[PDB]
Amino acid sequence: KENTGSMKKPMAKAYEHPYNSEHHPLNFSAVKIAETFHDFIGPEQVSPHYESFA
Amino acid sequence: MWYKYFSKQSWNLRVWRKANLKYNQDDFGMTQPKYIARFGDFRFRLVRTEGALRGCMFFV
Amino acid sequence: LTQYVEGQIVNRNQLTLKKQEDIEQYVLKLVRGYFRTTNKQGLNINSVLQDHGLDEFDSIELAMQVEEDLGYVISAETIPVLNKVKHFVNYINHVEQFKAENGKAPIA
């Protein structure tokens, strides 16, 4: 009886906000600022060497 | 059922026009003296309160 | 007068009960439809909504659905007294008699 199970068609999509995006989020938080901050200073400049530069 | 949650301890005052009507103006203030004449009686009769009278005479 | 139903727009229908028997059957169908209601078959005219897993906030969702089906405009001062099935029935009669005598809807 369980093997006879079928599935219902779900909704196609929910509401899509026309003024909110991943790169231009509508609301503000320190999380997005941190994402842009680390894009600016770039990744951790890992030294592959055995000794420090100085 | 808002009256169920209304606290009757707010009946200590009867606020009307920013004034408490349960104020013994007959025993305290410019209105306590009962030897006041026709002008002083007609003056308080208009304003009903020394606070409003003093405030207006402040600018006059 | 249209609403989305599972992503599809559907025309909304308004009901006119004007009968005590139709009111009891409507409210029961209404409460049994609410996903928070327990013992849907044990529900009767004298059933307390608190005894079926409903709180004050669930009585609001029910009233919100009465405005959808009947077109009523219920004030917030009337909702918190709807705590039984019998209460929804008597309120509906008071609204129909008021419109039949005063010629207007109750104050919202």
Next chain:
Amino acid sequence: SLHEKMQTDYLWVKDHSQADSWAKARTHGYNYIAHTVPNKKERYEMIWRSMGKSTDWELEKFRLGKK
């Protein structure tokens, strides 16, 4: 029980007779701190632990007392 038994024991918590005459550090280490050493965080833990023993881990006595 054994934990409280030894806490109350006078012998287990008793300054030696000459303890009064000895030189006593009257600071927990919060006056001059090492800020750039790799054990920086380990140093703070010993300051925090010293402040707690003085107050039985009731730091309200420290807030009220004199620094």
Next chain:
Amino acid sequence: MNPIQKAWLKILEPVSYVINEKMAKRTGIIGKLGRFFAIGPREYGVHPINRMFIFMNRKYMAFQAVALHRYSFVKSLTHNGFHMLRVFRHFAFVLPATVLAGLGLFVYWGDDNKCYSPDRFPYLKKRAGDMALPLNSLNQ
């Protein structure tokens, strides 16, 4: 990758074929030279200036939202909405006015952009070859 990099590719499409296919693998020095000037996705091609703007734009904008989102000084005068005693209501529109004034930060930057510079002394020095002049040169 951005459109300007793609534009370079269509223009350098034949050049890439000569360096990456022929020179980059021929032999010896011609290989080291072709593999050094190879054409492809930019290694460390990020532009920190672009990112610097994106960060400061976002950080300064979060400040605009705070400074501009204030309770009204006019509505607090009636003592009927949300505000009975507000002894510093006259400070409500200081930060908003301060942010709107920030729109002229770059429009009016330096002395030359705030007045008619030819009527000012520093203009004479620039036309004299950035040379010191007596302070009364504008009169003589």
Next chain:
Amino acid sequence: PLLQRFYRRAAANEIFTMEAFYHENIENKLRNLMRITKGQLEYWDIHTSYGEIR
């Protein structure tokens, strides 16, 4: 001494430890929630044997 700035280090140094022991602290909170859950599942193991007992 004016130990205000020190008080801000001691608290940050203490939070540094609570974050390092996040997995252990949370895992112990669930050990008690799992105990409650396992206790309620004992009622189902009893009913599944009633048919055999009968």
Next chain:
Amino acid sequence: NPNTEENTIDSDYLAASGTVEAEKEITSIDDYLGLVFAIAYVFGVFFYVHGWTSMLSHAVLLLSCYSIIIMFLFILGMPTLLLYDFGIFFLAYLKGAGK
């Protein structure tokens, strides 16, 4: 990491210590917090907080000279708006009943 960088540690706990004083019930912290920033460049001269403003103008104490005037005008208006809030009875709030 807000637990290792002493720069965000100092600023975070300092701000929390400043906003928590709203329980002192002075007035809306959302209103007078901006005046605190201005008053800080008046009395912060004792601690050289105005240092970063040395190249922003020909007067190193420009922001401090304006803030002292701002500090004076808005503090001068705090009593005036308080009487406006009392209404026409404002004299009874101060002295009480006449004699």
Next chain:
Amino acid sequence: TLQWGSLAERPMVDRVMSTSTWPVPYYQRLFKAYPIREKKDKMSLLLSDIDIDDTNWYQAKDFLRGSFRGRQIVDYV
């Protein structure tokens, strides 16, 4: 100790290696690299120690309704 050496060789004393390889790179990693802000298939870690609530039986019905025997259990309950 408080005497670790010269200022130039200060970043040398930080590395601690888990293997016997020589020479050893000196740089000690501070953070984990996170170049792409990817939506994690991982479930949120807030759902950690939340006591039983209404969301437990609402999700049980949704999962039970996916079976024939579960649809009977829900309707009868």
Next chain:
Amino acid sequence: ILDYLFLLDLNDDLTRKAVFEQVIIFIFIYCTMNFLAWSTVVELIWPTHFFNRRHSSSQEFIRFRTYTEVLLKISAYNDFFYVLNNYYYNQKLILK
């Protein structure tokens, strides 16, 4: 056309007051100063929020689910969570 537009003049502002050219300098500094102060206050609420929401719970009290924790549990579950629930159901509620 009105004389009010005369305020747009800066070539001959030295004939009336010569004050605008100096006051906006302060206004630009005042905005910069507030930008650093307010941005620090409003941004630095995240360390407290990040810590309390992850360490403030205790076993002698009930932790109540928030709005976000409701949506994530019901509308953001992964495949393993769906499998584990039905895996437990089929084995114990159906197959015992």
Next chain:
Amino acid sequence: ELEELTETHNYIPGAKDDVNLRGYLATQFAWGKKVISFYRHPADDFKCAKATKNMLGR
């Protein structure tokens, strides 16, 4: 949730947290040791004022 605190201007850390543990750690040695009241908004002002027969509302 952090956006909700920001967009509602609830920028007092720990106001909406029932147990502001971060607030207790920062006030372990503070003068007038206190934590923010629950759901305190930086804009609300419940100040009152009254006029009595005596001065200063006494």
Next chain:
Amino acid sequence: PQLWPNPNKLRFADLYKYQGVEMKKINDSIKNYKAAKFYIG
């Protein structure tokens, strides 16, 4: 999985149509530039 682009083992045509996360950001910015035509105009 293994068809993911590699900056070394890359074709010219593929790099011209890469359309990575960098472009995805730009396309969001462009959506604002277009929507601001009436406000700026």
Next chain:
Amino acid sequence: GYKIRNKSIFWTRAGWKNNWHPKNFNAPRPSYGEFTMGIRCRNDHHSFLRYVQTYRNMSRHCKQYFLGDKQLEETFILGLRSLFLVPYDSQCLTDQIKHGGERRFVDQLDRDFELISYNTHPYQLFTYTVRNEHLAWKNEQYEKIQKGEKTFEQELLDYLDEQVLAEKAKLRDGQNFSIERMTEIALHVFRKARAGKVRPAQDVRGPDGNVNDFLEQRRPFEHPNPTGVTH
């Protein structure tokens, strides 16, 4: 693991763990009618009905953007109640708050509805994003079932049902197949399955102490110059 050692952590000048009435100098004092001339106060008895109407608006205004998704309306309702039940279940004595907690929470909820009326509340945008990510995965399953193909979720359910038979077919000495055994069987399948996927590195450190990032490329140097695109 680690416990707070300071016993006075939750102490305040007002008492233990008091976040409802902090101690301040200007404390509340009573008022007497016979001596009070006038008063300026904003307190009232309208918070109860404002709490009711606020719930109805936040619910009805958020449902505008659910597109008739019944499962979303019910999930959102459970989340909306969790936001209104905070004062009823909190440790904070919301009935003893300084100047009236009822008025405080109502005014705080009103600020939320203001954002909801504009469809700008983070919970709204969070709801749309979370739901779209869910329906995309449910439609992927539906399209695979209509094609007669088997879903990744069913392959595990079927692969787990047989693994249980193999374990209980040999567990004859005992016959108590606990939920613990059933659990560690699934986890062994999830770890193996998850590891098979090409997922981004989540843990800082892999089997070795070294970090699993693209930056953890140290000596020795063995990589040549980078090569260009191929034609």
Next chain:
Amino acid sequence: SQFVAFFAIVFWLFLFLYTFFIIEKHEDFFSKKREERKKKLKELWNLKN
């Protein structure tokens, strides 16, 4: 000393003399809901959460 006396008088003391907070309340429906809400969770507490 003068720094403290300035703010301790212009703001702290000045407002303590001419402003106050009332002790009387107009609505107390939170107190009675927490009691009823606690009875709805009586069983969950019985499990010691």
Next chain:
Amino acid sequence: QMGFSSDNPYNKRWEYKWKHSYYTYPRDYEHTEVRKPQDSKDVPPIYFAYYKDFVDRWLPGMNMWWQRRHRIFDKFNVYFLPGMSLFFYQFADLALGFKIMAAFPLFLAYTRIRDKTLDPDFKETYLRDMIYQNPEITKYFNEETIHVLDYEFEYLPGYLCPEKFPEYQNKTWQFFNTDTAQAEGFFKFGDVESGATMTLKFKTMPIPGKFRYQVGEPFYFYDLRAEIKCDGVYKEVVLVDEKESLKKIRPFLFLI
């Protein structure tokens, strides 16, 4: 009648009482039913917050003054105070003292217009406490089961019958007032438990109390009548009768 009313459909008799904490006004008025995303207008037009404050705060405030304008057309507001303002306006350039004496009678007029145009608010908590003390009302009505169907309360225009209230035939009081300050209205109540309904008709007038110059209660019910109606029972309750209440206390006759 409620003077302060916006296009908002809910809570009409509470619109002026409720003080919302909104920074600005909501995008759309409170919805009476669930709507569609396209039923509303995203990103409302520019200067929308200023438009709402005019049509939701200013306009309903001016409609109140216009609805009750018949209460401010007295000889004191119309002729005395403006004429006193003009006498000193001719000398406003001589000194500052004339500017004050020319603006004071105008601020005083605004205060009387402000106070007189507000909706008459009685102490409803005194009323409900009064009816819930009567056993004939509590037999069918309880606060936990009562709901309001209609509410009307407005001032009475002009002077009343100069035999029931001879007080208002005073030329000195008429110089300050053109109305009576009395109000009349009703209350449509319903009980969801017993199904009972009643119309609580009442009349009010200001009275003096315990003092010489100050009013005791601006809205004192000197007539309070309830026509209770139930399933098949009709009762008429008289909590306060005017024939017996007007023999003990008289109106106050506000001045200024």
